[PDB]
Amino acid sequence: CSPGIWQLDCTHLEGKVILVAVHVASGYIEAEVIPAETGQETAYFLLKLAGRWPVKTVHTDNGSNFTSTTVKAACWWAGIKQEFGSMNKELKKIIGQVRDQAEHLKTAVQMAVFIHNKKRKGYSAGERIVDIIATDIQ
């Protein structure tokens, strides 16, 4: 519920890897299809994420995701810490719904992220995250 908390996991589809980041308090989502489930990709993703949102802490359902020196170096540089304390199903649901409209899985993934973030439920996840962060600054 704290505005700086994110959750990061990889899920699989069509023999590819989808990295999914969830802003816990809002439900807001960012995702990329990555070539390999490696620390290098995770580190690079964290750097991008941190330059865009105020990322303070990151949770995951697989702690071994964060063991690589590349990941530790990214968290160090960006000032992130990890912690031990379903979007994957919902995302895969939406992906299946728009899948036939794109050739590439990565395209379908971004269409799914779009739909999820804008969907009204009375505000959208996209609206919630900006309100939460903005309120937290002032």
Ligand X SMILES: Cc1ccc(-c2c(C)c3c(c(C)c2[C@H](OC(C)(C)C)C(=O)O)N(S(C)(=O)=O)Cc2cccc(F)c2-3)c(O)c1
Q: Which residues are annotated as a binding site?
A: 9, 61
Annotated binding site for Mg(2+): 9, 61
| Residues in 49-78 that interact with ligand X by CB under 6 A | 69-70, 73-74, 77
Q: How far is the CB of 55 from ligand X (least distance, A)?
A: 14
Q: How many residues bind ligand X (CB under 6 A)?
A: 8
- Give the x/- contact pattern for ligand X in 77-96, rule: CB under 6 A: x-------------------
Per-position DSSP letters for 40-89, written without gaps between them: HHHHHHHHHHHTTS---EEE-S-GGGG-SHHHHHHHHHHT-EE----HHH
Q: Report the alpha-carbon distance of residue 129 to residue 72 in Å, rounded.
A: 26
Q: How far is the CB of 118 from ligand X (least distance, A)?
A: 30
- Rounded to 10 degrees, the C-alpha dihedral 44/50/55/59 comes to -10
Q: Which is nearer to ligand X, 78 or 130 (CB)?
A: 78
Contact yes or no for 78/50 (Cβ under 8 A): yes
Q: How far is the CB of 137 from ligand X (least distance, A)?
A: 25
Q: How far is the CB of 98 from ligand X (least distance, A)?
A: 30
Spatial strand order of the sheet with 81-82 comes to 28-34, 16-23, 5-13, 57-59, 81-82
* C-alpha closest to that of 110 among 14, 19, 15, 7: 19
- Give the x/- contact pattern for ligand X in 9-48, rule: CB under 6 A: -------------------------------x--xx----
| Residues of this chain that bind ligand X (CB under 6 A) | 40, 43-44, 69-70, 73-74, 77
